[PDB]
Amino acid sequence: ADIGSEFSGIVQQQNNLLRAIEAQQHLLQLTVWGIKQLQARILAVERYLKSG
Amino acid sequence: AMADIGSEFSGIVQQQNNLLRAIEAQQHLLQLTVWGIKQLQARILAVERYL
Amino acid sequence: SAMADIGSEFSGIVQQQNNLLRAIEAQQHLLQLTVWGIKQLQARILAVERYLKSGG
Amino acid sequence: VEWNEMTWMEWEREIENYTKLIYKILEESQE
Amino acid sequence: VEWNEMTWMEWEREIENYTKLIYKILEESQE
Amino acid sequence: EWNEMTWMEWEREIENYTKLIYKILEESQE
Ligand SMILES: [Mg+2]
């Protein structure tokens, strides 16, 4: 009745929330990679300027 | 038990809205970190080219 | 079975919300770490920029 | 340059605002 | 450097893909 | 608790939180 109808917005939403988190994880994983890449490129420059 | 069961629903829909709100704010945060990383990448680039 | 079925359907949902909340919290820890990293980098890039233009 | 300094101060401001917003939401969620 | 140009183009490509996805999901969550 | 923070600690925490999140997401699936 109202139970089955109520559980409807809820279950839909729970799966939406899950899908959002999974996608945002991919975004986090990509920002981490980007940060690691820059770190390595800053080093390269610093160590270059400290050797020059 | 009819009373409690109804209270269970409220806690669930509240929490569901809270989690949705957190995810939207988290998304704003993510876009900001992406922006920052893009700025720095271009600045690394300018320096790298300079050298 | 009715009231029972309803209870289990609640329990699964509530358990799931807790999973989602924990995931979000862990993700927020990650975000804050990325913010730390970005700040660190920004400063070191800013110092390299000034150094190159202090020599100029 | 003066513009980049501006945009990075604005960045810090938005980081704060959303960080506090999410702390409050998550704190609400723990009750 | 070219090797770096490639990786960061892909990075941006992947960022857009998942962002678009999250937007779609968040939109759906509002209805 | 955060400080003293370093790139080593940063990496270690990234890895543990990520594994944690994977664990939660995988438990969510079934
Ligand atoms: Mg945690």
The count of structural domains within chain C is 1
Can you say how many angstroms the Cα of residue E1 is from the centroid of all Cα atoms in its chain? 23
Task: Give the phi and the psi of residue D30 in degrees, each rounded to 5.
Answer: -95, 40
User: Other CB atoms closer than 10 Å to residue A37's CB: what's the count?
Assistant: 17
Q: What is the resolution of this structure in A?
A: 2.0
Solved using:
X-ray
Show the tokens assigned to D10: 């604005």
Question: Scanning every residue of chain B, which has its alpha carbon at the shortest distance from the alpha carbon of D1?
Answer: B43
Show the tokens assigned to A11: 């279950």
Specify the residue for token string 């080219």.
Answer: B49
Show the tokens assigned to E26: 């968040």
Chains that touch B (3 or more CB pairs under 8 A): A, C, D, E
Q: How far is the CA of A13 from the centre of ligand 1 (A)?
A: 22
State the number of CA atoms in the 13 A half-sphere of A34 facing the CB: 30
**What are the residues whose beta carbons fall under 8 Å from the beta carbon of B32, sequence distance 6 or more?**
D11, D14, D15, D18
CB B29 within 8 A of CB D19: yes
Cα torsion angle, B35, B41, B42, B43, sign: positive
CB nearest C28 (choices: D8, D15, D22): D22
User: Nearest CA to E26 among B20, B19, D22, C23?
Assistant: B20
Q: Name residue C21's amino acid.
A: L
**What are the residues whose beta carbons fall under 8 Å from the beta carbon of E3, sequence distance 6 or more?**
none
Can you say how many angstroms the Cα of residue A35 is from the centroid of all Cα atoms in its chain? 13
Q: Where are the domains of chain E?
A: 1-31
Which helix (H) or strand (E) segment holds residue E26: the answer is helix E2-29
User: Nearest CA to B41 among E16, E17, E8?
Assistant: E8
- Domain residues for the domain of A11 are 1-52
Q: How far is CA A38 from each of CA A33, C54, D27, rounded to the nearest angstrom?
A: 9, 23, 34
Q: How far is CA C4 from each of CA C8, C10, C18, D1, rounded to the nearest angstrom?
A: 6, 10, 21, 66
